[PDB]
Amino acid sequence: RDMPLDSDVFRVPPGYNAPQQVHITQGDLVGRAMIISWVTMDEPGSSAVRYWSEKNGRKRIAKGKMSTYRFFNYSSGFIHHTTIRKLKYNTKYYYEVGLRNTTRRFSFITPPQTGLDVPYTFGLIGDLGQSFDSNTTLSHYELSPKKGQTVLFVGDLSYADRYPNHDNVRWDTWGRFTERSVAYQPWIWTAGNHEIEFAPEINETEPFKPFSYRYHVPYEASQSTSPFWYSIKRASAHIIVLSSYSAYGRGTPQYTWLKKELRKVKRSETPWLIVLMHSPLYNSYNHHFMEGEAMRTKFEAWFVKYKVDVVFAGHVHAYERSERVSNIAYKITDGLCTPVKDQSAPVYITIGDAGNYGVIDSNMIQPQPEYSAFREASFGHGMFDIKNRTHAHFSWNRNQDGVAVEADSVWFFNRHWYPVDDST
Amino acid sequence: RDMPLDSDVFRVPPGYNAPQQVHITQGDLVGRAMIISWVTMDEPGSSAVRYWSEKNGRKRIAKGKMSTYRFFNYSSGFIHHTTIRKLKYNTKYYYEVGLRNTTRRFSFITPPQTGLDVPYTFGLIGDLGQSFDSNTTLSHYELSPKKGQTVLFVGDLSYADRYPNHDNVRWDTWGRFTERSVAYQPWIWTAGNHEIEFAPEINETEPFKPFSYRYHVPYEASQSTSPFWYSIKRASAHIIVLSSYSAYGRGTPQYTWLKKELRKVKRSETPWLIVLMHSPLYNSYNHHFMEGEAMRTKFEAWFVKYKVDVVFAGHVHAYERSERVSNIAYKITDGLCTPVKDQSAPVYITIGDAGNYGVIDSNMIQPQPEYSAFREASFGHGMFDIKNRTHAHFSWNRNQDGVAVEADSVWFFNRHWYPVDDST
Ligand SMILES: *[C@@H]1O[C@H](CO)[C@@H](O)[C@H](O)[C@H]1NC(C)=O
Ligand SMILES: *[C@@H]1O[C@H](CO)[C@@H](O)[C@H](O)[C@H]1NC(C)=O
Ligand SMILES: *[C@@H]1O[C@H](CO)[C@@H](O)[C@H](O)[C@H]1NC(C)=O
Ligand SMILES: *[C@@H]1O[C@H](CO)[C@@H](O)[C@H](O)[C@H]1NC(C)=O
Ligand SMILES: *[C@@H]1O[C@H](CO)[C@@H](O)[C@H](O)[C@H]1NC(C)=O
Ligand SMILES: *[C@@H]1O[C@H](CO)[C@@H](O)[C@H](O)[C@H]1NC(C)=O
Ligand SMILES: *[C@@H]1O[C@H](CO)[C@@H](O)[C@H](O)[C@H]1NC(C)=O
Ligand SMILES: *[C@@H]1O[C@H](CO)[C@@H](O)[C@H](O)[C@H]1NC(C)=O
Ligand SMILES: *[C@@H]1O[C@H](CO)[C@@H](O)[C@H](O)[C@H]1NC(C)=O
Ligand SMILES: *[C@@H]1O[C@H](CO)[C@@H](O)[C@H](O)[C@H]1NC(C)=O
Ligand SMILES: [Fe+3]
Ligand SMILES: [Fe+3]
Ligand SMILES: [Zn+2]
Ligand SMILES: [Zn+2]
């Protein structure tokens, strides 16, 4: 069910050495920097970016870097990554890319300065891929009446690895496909298993290679030493991204990083604490049932201890929402190994149903266990709408429904400012 | 309690650019190759190794490679790694190193060709370090009346990271300290947390750096892509080494490797299946209690499924032995989370009590849980004596006892050839 190469969606922008696959992301810790990335295929080109704000039209230029990589019998075009810094908050900016030959213009809006009651709306997409289904999800998102302002991407970007020799062209098509969204609003990246691409057979054994060349993140802004885990603050949220497929043993870099990071969170500053990861800790579908255990046994208590609000994950191609639940009392022999309601525990949501290669996970653990508040095997995306320092509203829009039909809806009461039973 | 720099044990061999820190290991999958490693401090020197067998005195020369690394304000001497191939089995060989200036000679004996009833005796040392205690353990091992023929090292080699800026000299002293054993019999290496050495503060952020420069392993012989997990066959055993601090998520390289490896094991060929790892899956001491959970939730079933015989670990500075126990029935809500006796499960032993920096873990979970067959907080080492395709005898010698006093002893009945209750 993957859209064919000719799909209008994959068309390449006309012009000699025309910037294609344009995509942006937050380039700093707090909102005033953007990472602009694109690809030129005819010749290297300039990595300069011209930009100016709608108000003070002073056109400025940022200079980035270029790179290329070879996968097996594949050879990238010229990848460019330029970081624009010191932007004004809440301002529309225009940026042009491809200054030497064919120029293309875009715009994005910086977010508000971080604050306690600053509202902001995040889109939630996970497991997108490039089947028609994916096209649909992306449209629904684009049409959401409550318009999203940044997508929190939960992993598994293009599924190129399903193709033989991971045909990296499928990474080029995916990037052209998603440009209509990402060239205008940042997407926060999370690495999934389809990104690992460990292919010893074709002698490609460096995990996350294509992903890492194409998608960059401000990991050094948190003081991370790897692009696979980091964090960013935006509006009223403090988002922490993790890597299910990197290492989390005690003493490892990810483990060490997360521990200090959780301590740097200030809720008086960013009331909403969100965590992203690919493999879900809590999941009652049969597919990938209990893979999140290892990580769970390692980070759950921290989450409960710091009262994180939500934990979005993908990986299971379906939707599921939980009860604020914890399972942190087990001691091997004491028999306390059953999820109990806990109002300090976050709500674990899973939205890996954006489309993938057109397949849904329908098999579910019958009967719906207690910790599971709601589950459905439908394609769709989600929206998490921060309203207050106390209120945020989550919605789940099915692909079958019309653009404005929230097939699931829930109000989140802030675990730190208004820790009242939000559970159904 | 770390032996002082002057300790006779740390003395540097006399001579200009005299090979120091000599150490060997298996260089291939089955026993006929050795990796010779040493360090020269005055000047680079030759990486050639001269060797010949006691019988056919034809002196041959192998050519290796040289490397150096800088840690913080530290600078290695010249590290050399040469692999000698195509040795005859069961033969004493002599090797000389330092051919250009000061030459030093050693000898090692190749093991028997792999076989069903080939006996062999392994020493078990974990968590050695360089306190006086360590010196003692190493002596007891050297004096064991049943002489060991290869040490299976379970992690945490020198504890240099306890020193400021991980003072890499402490890696040089440790290497000189252990030379008396390793220059003559291989030690199989396992990476522990003290080897990770992730030190962002001093800008050293590449895990396992000093360890990896100094200690090499035949990881490519198994078809591993990293020196942190691999396997070797020797005599009648098939040993699999794992990395508690590397990644084991589903789809990661270690996870993928182990899965295929377990399938390549042939018990008609090597009856004894042993697994090494630093962090113990089963442990009833308070220190590091339940850190092995994550890995447990990921590899336990495989171990039971393939009937591995023993799983040696370190990390807890004490000794403990278990019952053939499994805990693989949990499904979150079904309440089946209690270790039950299982005669397909291996015996989980922990010998991280070789000395470290002179400290023992005495605090234990009172009362001794059912799965725990025996535990004691004493310094010492172990020996695993393969006798038959059905019998192997494990012993634990306390440092306080005389060299021949087995403070714990157990016969192992082969999970594949004689799966009879060996449990006490
Ligand atoms: C790569 O190799 C496959 C077969 O191995 C071939 O069919 C394909 O067209 C090749 N692609 C390139 C870009 O050479
Ligand atoms: C691209 O730009 C350069 C400089 O602006 C120009 O000289 C060249 O002819 C242009 N067109 C192509 C196809 O290179
Ligand atoms: C994808 O969706 C857009 C509208 O959102 C439409 O114009 C386009 O034709 C669709 N293409 C495919 C291949 O589904
Ligand atoms: C590439 O192909 C296979 C897969 O590992 C192997 O036979 C070969 O040695 C690999 N590496 C190289 C350098 O060719
Ligand atoms: C937060 O938002 C909800 C719904 O938009 C509203 O009813 C509530 O009173 C708001 N809280 C504050 C403190 O304004
Ligand atoms: C490294 O630095 C420490 C202090 O930072 C100093 O005392 C020590 O002697 C130094 N070692 C070397 C080899 O420079
Ligand atoms: C070391 O060996 C070389 C060649 O064998 C010799 O010329 C040199 O003088 C020797 N001694 C020293 C201290 O370098
Ligand atoms: C270490 O033990 C050896 C004997 O095994 C002894 O000769 C040596 O003096 C001891 N050194 C220290 C510092 O304990
Ligand atoms: C080295 O020291 C600290 C620890 O990260 C930091 O302030 C500095 O930027 C580090 N890196 C470099 C290249 O100096
Ligand atoms: C294996 O060894 C034990 C003890 O050494 C012995 O009693 C037993 O009979 C042996 N088994 C065989 C098959 O020889
Ligand atoms: Fe997926
Ligand atoms: Fe230790
Ligand atoms: Zn996935
Ligand atoms: Zn340890």
Distances in Å between the Cα of A165 and the Cα atoms of A76, A193, A207 are 14, 16, 15
Q: Is B194 a catalytic residue?
A: no
Task: Find chain B residues with C-beta within 8 A of A249's C-beta.
Answer: 193, 244-246, 279, 294-295
* Of the residues A87, A114, A141, the one at which a domain ends: A114
Mutate to test the pocket of ligand 2, among A40, A43, A101, A102 (most ligand atoms within 8 A of CB): A101
Domain span at residue A364 reads 115-424
Give me the amino acid identity at A187.
W
Among candidates A154, A127, A194, which has minimal Cα distance to A277?
Answer: A154
Do strands A272-276 and A237-241 pair parallel, antiparallel, or not at all (unpaired)? parallel
- Domain with residue B218: its CATH number is 3.60.21.10
| Element of type H or E holding A114 | none
Smallest CA-to-CA distance from A214 within A77, A314, A99, A9 is with A77
Are the beta carbons of A120 and A235 closer than 8 angstroms?
yes
Q: In the beta sheet, which residues pair with residue B294? A: none
Q: Where are the beta strands (DSSP E) in A87-173?
A: 92-97, 104-109, 120-125, 151-153
Q: Which residue is closest to A224 within chain B, CA to CA?
A: B200
Residue for token digits 């802030």? A414
Torsion of CA B127, B128, B130, B134, to 10 degrees: 130
- How far is residue B22 CA from its own chain's centroid? 17
Count Cβ atoms below 10 Å from residue B236 Cβ, excluding itself: 25
Domain match, B230 and B334 both? yes
Both A147 and A67 in a single domain? Answer: no
CA atoms within 13 A on the CB side of A194: 26
Buried (b) or exposed (e) across B103-119, using 16+ Cβ within 10 A?
ebebebbbbeebeeebb
Nearest residue to B297 (alpha-carbon basis) of B284, B320, B279: B279
Query: What is the C-alpha separation between B310 and B204, in angstroms, rounded?
Result: 36
Q: Are residues A88 and A157 in the same domain?
A: no
Task: Report CA-CA distances (Å) from B384 to A362, B312, B349, B374, B392.
Answer: 50, 10, 11, 17, 7
* Nearest residue to A162 via CA among A193, A136, A194: A194
Angle at A314 between CA A309 and CA A317, to 5 degrees: 135
- Separation CA A371–CA A283 (nearest Å): 9
* Chain B residues within 8 A of A244 when measuring between CB atoms: 249
Cβ distance B274 to B394 under 8 Å?
Answer: no
Q: A-B interface: how many C-beta pairs under 8 angstroms?
A: 109
Q: Enumerate the residues of chain B whose CB falls inside 8 A of the CB of residue A250.
A: 193, 245, 279, 291
Look at A251 and B198 and tell me if their CB atoms are within 8 Å: yes
Cβ(B284)–Cβ(B320) below 8 Å: yes
Asked if residue B6 belongs to a domain, the reply is: no
Q: Which residues contact A165 (CB under 8 A, 6 or more apart)?
A: A71, A72, A73, A74, A199, A202
The reply to whether ligand 10 has any atom less than 6 angstroms from the CB of B390 is: yes
Minimum CA–CA partner of B225 in chain A: A205
Give ∠ CA B324-B329-B335 in degrees, rounded to 5.
120
CA distance B157 to B166: 13
Residue in the structure block whose two tokens are 């353990």: B137
**B338 touching chain A per CB within 8 A:** yes
Q: What is the largest CA-CA distance in chain B?
A: 69
Of A233, A212, A198, A171, the C-alpha closest to A2 is A171
Nearest residue of A to residue B204 by CA position? A225
Of the partner residues A247, A251, A330, the one whose CB lies closest to the CB of residue B337: A330
* CA distance linking residue B109 with residue B91, whole number of Å: 5
CA-based nearest residue to B254, from B279, B291, B225: B225
Q: Give the residue from chain B lying closest to A196, CA to CA.
A: B252
Point out which residues pair with B2 in neighbouring strands. Answer: B131
Distance, CA of B242 to CA of B189 (rounded, Å): 10
Residues A32 and A120 in one domain: no
Angstrom distance (rounded) from CA A55 to CA B155: 62
| Residue where the block lists tokens 């401090």 | B41
Residues of B in contact with A252 (CB under 8 A): 196, 198, 207, 245
Sign of the CA dihedral running B318, B324, B329, B335 = negative
Rounded to an integer, what distance in angstroms lies between the CA atom of residue A255 and that of residue A229? 10
Return d(Cα A386, Cα A233) in angstroms, integer: 14
Tally of domains within chain A = 2
> Is A279 in a helix, a strand, or coil?
coil
Alpha-carbon Rg for chain A in angstroms: 21
Q: How many whole angstroms separate alpha carbon A412 and alpha carbon A376? A: 20
* φ, ψ for residue A255, nearest 5 deg: -55, -55
- Kindly state whether residue B2 falls inside one of the protein's structural domains: no
Chain B residues with beta carbon closer than 8 angstroms to that of A207: 252-253
Cα first-last separation, chain A: 37
Residue A310 within a domain: yes
Phi-psi region of A85 (alpha: psi -120 to 50; beta: other; left: phi over 0): beta
Could you give phi then psi for residue A102, rounded to 5 degrees? -95, 110
In three-state secondary structure terms, A120 is strand
Beta bridge partners of B152: B124, B188
> In this structure, are B229 and B367 located in the same domain?
yes
- For residue A292, the SS3 value is coil
C-alpha of residue B98 to centroid of ligand 6, in Å: 30
DSSP A70: B
Of the residues A114, A134, A160, which one is the last residue of a structural domain? A114
Within-domain flag for B324: yes
User: Coil, helix or strand for A154?
Assistant: coil
- B81 vs B66: CA distance, rounded Å: 7
Cβ–Cβ < 8 Å for A61, A52: no
Query: What experimental approach yielded this model?
Result: X-ray
Burial code (b: 16+ CB inside 10 Å, e: under 16) for A26-63 equals bbbbbbbbbbbbbbbbeeebbbbbbbebeeeeeeeebe
What angle separates helix B169-182 from helix B132-143, to the nearest 10 degrees? 10
Q: Say whether residue A290 is in contact with chain B using an 8 A CB cutoff.
A: yes
Resolution of the solved structure (Å)? 2.7
Same domain membership, residue B206 and residue B81: no
Quick one: which atom of ligand 6 is closest to the CA of B74? Answer: 13
What are the φ/ψ torsions at residue A142 (nearest 5 degrees)? -60, -30
Q: In what order do the strands lie in the sheet with B406-413?
A: B187-188, B151-153, B120-125, B380-386, B391-398, B406-413
**Residues A357, A378 within the same domain:** yes
What pairing do the DSSP bridges indicate for beta strands A187-188 and A151-153? parallel
d(CA B323, CA B315): 19
d(CA B9, CA B20): 12
Contacts of B195 (CB under 8 A, 6+ apart): B155, B156, B157, B208, B210, B211, B245
Out of B92, B114, B136, a domain closes at B114
User: What's the CA-to-centroid distance between A132 and ligand 3, angstroms?
Assistant: 8
A27 in any annotated domain = yes
Q: Quick check: A1 and A136 in contact, CB under 8 A?
A: no
In A287-388 the beta strands, taken as DSSP E runs, fall at 310-313, 319-322, 325-326, 340-341, 347-351, 372-376, 380-386
CB of B257 within 8 A of CB of A203? Answer: no
CA B142, distance to chain mean position in Å, is 16
Do A92 and A209 fall into the same domain? no
Neighbours of B100 (CB within 10 A): 13
**Which ligand gives the minimal distance to the CA of A203?**
4
Q: Torsion angle, CA of B69/B72/B73/B79, rounded to 10 degrees?
A: -20
Regarding whether A195 and A110 lie in a shared domain, the answer is no
Four-residue CA torsion sign, A169, B257, A213, A280: positive
In chain A, positions 237-266, which contact chain B (CB-CB < 8 Å)? 244-253, 256
Question: Is the CB of B335 less than 8 angstroms away from the CB of A330?
Answer: no
- Gap between the Cα atoms of B313 and B279, Å rounded: 6
Angle CA(A56)–CA(A21)–CA(A156) in degrees, nearest 5?
115
Cβ atoms of residues A110 and A32 within 8 Å: yes
End-to-end Cα spacing for chain B: 37
Q: A175 to each of A141, A227, B207, B331, B413, how far by Cα in Å?
A: 17, 19, 33, 39, 58
- Asked if residue A293 and residue A162 are part of one domain, the reply reads yes
Instruction: Specify whether the CB–CB gap between B174 and B157 falls below 8 A.
Output: yes
User: Is-contact B250 B302, C-beta < 8 A?
Assistant: no
Asked if B61 and B97 touch (Cβ cutoff 8 Å), the reply is: no
Q: What CA–CA distances, in Å, run from A24 to A44, A55, A213, A241?
A: 20, 21, 14, 17
Q: Both tokens of residue A52?
A: 């100016």
In a domain, A13, yes or no: no
Please give the Cα distance from A151 to B106 (Å, whole number). 64
Structural domain contains residue B406: yes
Q: Where are the beta strands (DSSP E) in A54-150?
A: 60-63, 65-67, 78-84, 92-97, 104-109, 120-125
Give the 3-state secondary structure of residue A165: helix
Q: How far is CA B87 from the centre of its chain?
A: 23
H-helix or E-strand spanning residue A408: strand A406-413
Phi, psi of B49 (to 5 degrees): -130, 130
Instruction: Determine the Cα–Cα distance for residues B113 and B158; give it in Å rounded to an integer.
Output: 33
Residue nearest to atom 10 of ligand 6 (CA): B73
Find out whether B276 and B239 touch, Cβ atoms under 8 Å.
yes
Q: Which long-range contacts (CB under 8 A, 24 or more apart) does A7-11 make?
A: A9/A135, A9/A176, A9/A177, A10/A173, A10/A176, A10/A177, A11/A176
How far is Cα B66 from Cα B77, in angstroms, rounded to an integer?
10
Q: Are residues A54 and A192 in the same domain?
A: no
Q: Does B326 touch chain A (CB under 8 A)?
A: no
Question: How many alpha carbons lie under 13 Å from residue B325 in its C-beta half-sphere?
Answer: 22
The catalytic residue among A287, A288, A391, A393 is: A288
Of A193, A279, A297, the CB nearest to B294: A297
Q: Nearest CA to CA, how far is B122 from chain A (Å)?
A: 28
The 3-class SS string of chain B reads CECCCCCHHHCCCCCCCCCEEEEEEECCCCCCCEEEEEEECCCCCCCEEEEEECCCCCCEEEECEEECCECCCCECCEEEEEEECCCCCCCEEEEEECCCCCCEEEEEECCCCCCCCCCEEEEEECCCCCEHHHHHHHHHHHHCCCCCCCEEECCCCCCHHHCHHHCCHHHHHHHHHHHHHHCCCCEECCCCHHHHCCEHHHCECCCCHHHHHHCCCCCCCCCCCCCCCEEEEECCEEEEECCCCCCCCCCCHHHHHHHHHHHHCCCCCCCEEEEECCCCCCCCECCCCCCCHHHHHHHHHHHHHCCCCEEEECCCCCEEEECCEECCCCCCCCCCCCCEECCCCCEEEEECCCCCCCCCCCCECCCCCCCEEEEECCCEEEEEEECCCCEEEEEEEECCCCCCCEEEEEEEECCCCCCCCCCC
**Separation between Cα atoms, residue A62 and residue A84, nearest integer Å:** 6
How far apart are the C-alpha atoms of B421 and B31, rounded to whole Å? 32
Q: Tell me how far apart the 2 most distant CA atoms of chain A are, in Å.
A: 69
Residue B9 resides in a domain: no
Torsions phi, psi of B298, nearest 5? -105, -35
Distance between CA atoms of A2 and A302, rounded to whole angstroms?
39
CATH number at residue A49: 2.60.40.380
Strands B372-376 and B319-322: antiparallel
Give B198 to chain A, closest Cα distance, Å: 7
If DSSP codes are grouped into helix, strand and coil, which group holds residue A229? Answer: coil
Nearest-CA neighbor of A320 among A275, A344, A357, A286?
A286
* Residues A160/A168, Cβ–Cβ less than 8 Å: yes
d(C-alpha B322, C-alpha B340), whole Å: 12
Is residue B57 located within the same domain as residue B202? no
Q: Locate tokens 């000698």: which residue?
A: B84
Structural element, H or E, at residue A244: none
All residues at 6 or more sequence positions from B421 whose CB lies less than 8 Å from its CB, including other chains: B343, B413
Nearest to A162 by CA among A145, A174, A150: A174
* Phi, psi (degrees; rounded to nearest 5) at A214: -80, -35
